[PDB]
Design a binder for this molecule. Structure first.
Ligand SMILES: C=C(/N=C/c1c(COP(=O)(O)O)cnc(C)c1O)C(=O)O
Ligand SMILES: C=C(/N=C/c1c(COP(=O)(O)O)cnc(C)c1O)C(=O)O
Ligand SMILES: [K+]
Ligand SMILES: [K+]
Ligand SMILES: [K+]
Ligand SMILES: [K+]
Lengths: 455, 455, 455, 455
């Protein structure tokens, strides 16, 4: 079953519908790197679900009531009581987006030499942990590393790995547990409530803190409602509130599940840490009552978080992504499984098995997808992994994928069909996809501006 | 066959359905007239494509640059030159919507006792004609009155009927020819360029004026591009400009094909009529420099008329309607054919063969659709046709229909599937729909607020 | 005393600040007719207070929540309950602006041959009365015709004139009393509560209806609060509610005191007339639940009417106009007295006493004002009176004025100083102002497009 | 002397004052720190000109055309080319506001142990310098530290101090010169073009880099046009472009002179520094293609920076501030002189001569202003100066001031009169203001959330 959109269209965004021949010229002018395409040349932009969401009429009404005061804005108090109501944490500090909150948390909660352990990681999150002296430890269940394995709650932490870390390093040497919902690196996989409670139980017995990386916590809550036994009579809001009852705080990117184009925040329960967070936010972000956001954006984020609690909205959000994954799977196209909350990942290693990883199959597949459909997708393979600048060799990731990342409330099932139909057509003559080589490679951040040409 | 939306969703609004028990209460509280239901109590609102359209980001940017000056507004100058460029008429008078422009035309162009001849009637148009003393003559071809007959360009005027009217009544007794594009009450049926040419040549030879109802002229232009030999490679804008070259002026409801929520205008080439038009607009609408519109709405209408010329936009608009009709026809649901530009018309005579037209089956079917589905649709049969102003009897149209009217850029194919799947289910107990009778009948335009009860 | 603005600026409208030499070229290109100037060439636009108001952040939030449904819009229900609460009438029909409501009222309430009597008149209001067969009778107090006489509540109806009309024509032959608040033709003069009650008392004894032309009823209520003994402890809302308790209905232009750029409505208490109004509004305006307005505009007008009830807003509105009048009066510049609620009228006959009325002193003064300051003002003298087309002679009004009409919440006291300082400078060498002659004069609506040159 | 607003009011927001009894409660609940008061409880909010500006209609039209794409946004390209055109720097990295750009510059450009030398300190700037290991050296001329001394271009660097620092420490030990325009904590004092030239020539001869704090560069350009010989006929844009020609890069808070509510950026000419800057921005702000800003805010900032170049706009901006200072000085109120570009600084040492600086008279005066007036103002003295990081004692600035900071395009001269009239009244019982002491002191940037109590 795939539900209809539980909303109608209030206003549209113009696009140009340039045809295939012209798309090829734009792809060549971008050096076959979709990160270099101009937004104005793109019909369906699946580069990311971050900050690309469509807001509602109610959010846009809030955008006209921005109280732009430097301190004490009504919009901050609205955001504050909304997050306190829906997440249940005592204190909240706004930040301009998620990595601003991570900066603060890692400076507040880490002593050099300590460990942070998590269910895999995200690049900014782990950077701020390591920048502040922590050693990262993956404690996700082994199954999460098998990208073909179709099992539920693949994001769950292996409690035995957590126990082993505690035994070998000592509780006083673990800064905190970083529990992400959902788990990005595994393809957007959810964590069960049973797992969040077991982790809270174990850590609490040793005095260890747990902070959630909560950026897709609403997609996560929908998976719990759909698939965890006993939650079929619970509302999304009830599930979200219980999830965070097992954390000491969180970092949140409103740009994902709060349905906004900018915004984030930091939550915590501890008064002392809250006091310290207020001393630090002024350094990097702004006042404890705006945190690097315009008043109108704290307002849009307060309204959007509350909209995200509607069951039909998040059911349709997740099932629209599933529709795309299901259609590709039915045609035999290789994808990471199960499909996650926010994106479908094509397995470009298998899609282009006539190409070596040194010929950048994910990068080339993403270029072909744009030329054939006007769809932009993100390379998430060897190019994005970067190069070891000590040795000069590529970092070679096991996952060589193209990410079809779906913004919330922007596209329809007919756009999903455009995407799927083009990919399926490509797959039917996949052996024609050509390898790529660098013709310009910057020293750092190479996925952003590198240019290629066909081998 | 069915293209995806040639735009993205920029902002949304929520939709909801109240339980069947509650819809039943709402429907009897509205006296079984869909026009009397409240917006909140509706899930997918197909009452009309008039004024319900979704605007684009460019239009909303224009809405922030409303120049609200009483005379000399930049927005007026933009609307004026846009209409002069795209329609080719010498002079433009804005009005707050289409029936304001009809009020002006009918007062300017009709001497009492004269005839006005058009391709089928429309409710407000015919009222303003008769209120100023004209007799309406229907000169559409006979086929346009038979719902099931699938022929192209059903909106065309019968040149033999036009010729007969001239011979029997004399050209000086004909105030003007009223040529509507598309023809709404025939089901949204288009008029060919050949027919517009032939009507221009015959009327010009007798000195008779021709005024167009331009309200859905862009839908009409699409049908010409798609189906009239020789126009396959002309742009929508070129087709529109050539259409109006066969006319002396037009009335326009911008609330339809100009993609706005309010607005209309009157165009003419004649200098003396324009002078008279400016005198009269002041009485009813406003100064000729804004015509009962805010500046920002003149701007939105100027921008939207030009957006409507985009081929992919209007192809998708029309094919989305066609999709709904195709799905209903594939299931045996009786509809007006061919599907028109803006709506699917269910054939109430066949949905409700157990009822005579004096039991108002179209009014009754629209009520039942709301109760079982929460979808709102409009009566388009004997109730809308009004009464003969000489005999006091119902006008008795052969087309007794219920209109599923599609606002532009608001809904998706998934919403069309919800509508279609629901009507297909109602079709399978069509015998349950009861006949209706008046308990309150207005003295004119009675369909708007009439109240009925079951027989 | 002159209060500070009881609001701050949320957003600004760009203007060009072209200098004097360039303003002279624009005035010449406009044929020395300020009605022909382009809005983009004007610094301070005092042509009219109609539809030119600045909205609040709350209104603009409402503009993002337009429910554009054809029937049953939430925005209509908001407008409806707001007007019922604040004005106290039983029924309300929206119209696109005031003259739409006048059209409806005059068709509903007049039998040909009857009289309508009022405290002077407004052009659209009287047109719709006469178009429907009424003979207009001025029953304003004689003082209102003395433009130099500085007395309170100059808009009051002479009860003895009303009594005389009843005695001479008979009550059954009077369609209604049209009581305007404030009185435009006398310069914006208020009516006392004592007068509204005496008129209600007298008419009610004869079964005669009273309908208010309520377009500046809030300015009127402020004058009652400031100057009528016994109302110093009443809120503006309490005064407004009591005012309308003495009418059977009203016509309202939201474009004036409801702080919007478009919108109006018709109110009445009688069920039968309400039913008849709903039958007629569909003819000219739209549905009883939108009346020729987008949903967002019914919303903005509902919010704005309520904002207009704030005492500090309307005190500042009226006292900003008074500031302008007081400053001019102190320099000896001749104005209509007392200054009204919405505009200052310069007496161009006295300002330019070296010019005959046939040399259009008001028209010329308005041209000089624009050249010296970038301020546009309206000619309200012989040109606007038009020409007797039977005899060819000018209509020669006693008042030969330039109207400095002040939009609500748009300008500051420093803009008022620009206006006053420029006029005072002109007055100090008033003998240099040259007479004007026609070089193009249209047959009708001559103030709108006539062009002049210096004698 | 004082020009009127070179714009009209497009939309408003309401202002209100709570009773003195309630302001007293609010002030003690905020621990006598103005930063802790709530926006709703303030009547005229002069806490800061940062992020509080009113945007124009053109900017708000841009806000409807946010291109929210992660890379390649039209809004990014517009901001980039606007800054390249107007400032002349080769490369731009957007940041969410100014201290994000300072974070990046200080990490890129400082080796631990090096010196950074600037024209007076600023709070966040100096924190990022010292946090990355630099020692701050103040090389402004001595006069900038004496509040009462009325001399032009008080912001100028003392070239003798710069020369001395080079000789005593060696150019390789100076990380860069930090030249701020205007100089905020000297009272908004401008820097001359001659001084920017001379600093460029001396630093270039030793290979020392110069980075500007551009936050109020347009105010600065106005002072140059008004007061520096030879610039009287140069445009504001020409002056701005020449200023930045003497710099190697800049940090910008667009929240000041770019007329927006959020936004900033980092500019530089060096290719390698730009590459490093892009690596680092990802960690803290976002991708280099949006830098922690929504697309619509990049657009608003591109539009606003160009609006700021309008002469009449910035003349009025500065002269409105000057008006407030002139009125206060005419009454004997002690202020920093000359009045700067963005604010009037009351001299707390003279308003509160009965207090020593250890009793925090500036913090105390800001509290009392709120209680007696409801106007919010900011502490700018010993509390903001922080503590010496080697000795632990207060930094002891000669300037102990309370800032009346004027947001751009928000208030009127009538609002300035309200502020001035209120401060003049407080001046006449200045002896009543009590001394303060810390009850809560943050470890850095303590002024933001410090809590005090009366001594
Ligand atoms: C209201 C409808 N149509 C309006 C209309 C009108 C009247 O336009 P306004 O609704 O803008 O007055 C004139 N001519 C045609 C062919 C029309 O379809 C409708 O069909 O729902
Ligand atoms: C917050 C203020 N100023 C910020 C500022 C900053 C920091 O900018 P952000 O507030 O955008 O971080 C940098 N440099 C100067 C000269 C500044 O004035 C203020 O003065 O109120
Ligand atoms: K974004
Ligand atoms: K509408
Ligand atoms: K207007
Ligand atoms: K702000």
């Amino acid at each position: 079953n795939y539900p209809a959109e539980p909303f109608r269209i209030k206003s549209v965004e113009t696009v140009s519908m340039i045809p295939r021949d012209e798309r090829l010229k734009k792809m060549q002018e971008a050096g076959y790197n979709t990160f270099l395409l101009n937004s104005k040349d793109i019909y369906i932009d699946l580069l990311t679900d971050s900050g690309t969401n469509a807001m509602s009429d109610k959010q846009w009404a809030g955008m006209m009531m921005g109280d732009e005061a430097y301190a004490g804005s009504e919009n901050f108090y609205h955001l504050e009581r909304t997050v306190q109501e829906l997440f249940g944490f005592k204190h909240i500090v706004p930040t301009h987006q998620g990595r601003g909150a991570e900066n603060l948390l890692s400076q507040l909660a880490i002593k050099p030499g300590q460990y942070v352990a998590g269910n895999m990681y995200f690049t900014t999150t782990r950077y701020h942990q390591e920048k502040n002296g922590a050693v990262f430890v993956d404690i996700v269940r082994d199954e999460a590393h098998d990208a073909g394995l179709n099992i539920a709650f693949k994001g769950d932490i292996d409690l035995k790995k957590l126990q082993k870390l505690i035994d070998e390093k000592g509780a006083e040497n673990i800064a905190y547990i970083c529990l992400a919902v959902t788990v990005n690196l595994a393809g957007g996989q959810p964590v069960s409530m049973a797992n969040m409670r077991a982790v809270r139980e174990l850590t609490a017995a040793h005095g260890i803190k747990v902070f959630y990386d909560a950026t897709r916590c609403v997609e996560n809550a929908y998976f719990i409602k759909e698939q965890e036994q006993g939650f079929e009579n619970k509302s999304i809001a009830e599930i979200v509130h219980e999830m965070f009852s097992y954390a000491d705080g969180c970092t949140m990117s409103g740009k994902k599940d709060c349905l906004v184009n900018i915004g984030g925040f930091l939550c915590m329960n501890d008064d002392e840490m809250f006091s310290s967070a207020k001393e630090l936010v002024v350094v990097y972000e702004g006042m404890p009552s705006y945190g690097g956001l315009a008043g109108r954006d704290m307002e849009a984020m307060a309204i959007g978080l509350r909209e995200a609690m509607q069951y039909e909205y998040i059911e349709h959000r997740v099932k629209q992504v599933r529709y795309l994954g299901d259609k590709l799977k039915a045609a035999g196209v290789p994808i990471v499984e199960p499909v996650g909350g926010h994106a479908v990942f094509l397995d470009a290693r298998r899609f282009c098995e006539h190409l070596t990883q040194d010929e950048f199959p994910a990068q080339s597949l993403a270029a072909s997808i744009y030329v054939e459909t006007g769809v932009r997708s993100m390379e998430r393979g060897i190019i994005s992994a970067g190069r070891n600048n000590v040795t000069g060799e590529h970092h070679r990731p096991k996952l060589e994928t193209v990410r079809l990342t779906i913004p919330r409330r922007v596209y329809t099932y007919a756009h999903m069909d455009v995407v799927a139909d083009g990919i399926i057509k490509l797959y039917q003559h996949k052996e024609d996809i050509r390898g790529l080589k660098f013709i310009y490679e910057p020293k750092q951040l190479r996925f952003f501006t590198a240019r290629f040409d066909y081998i």
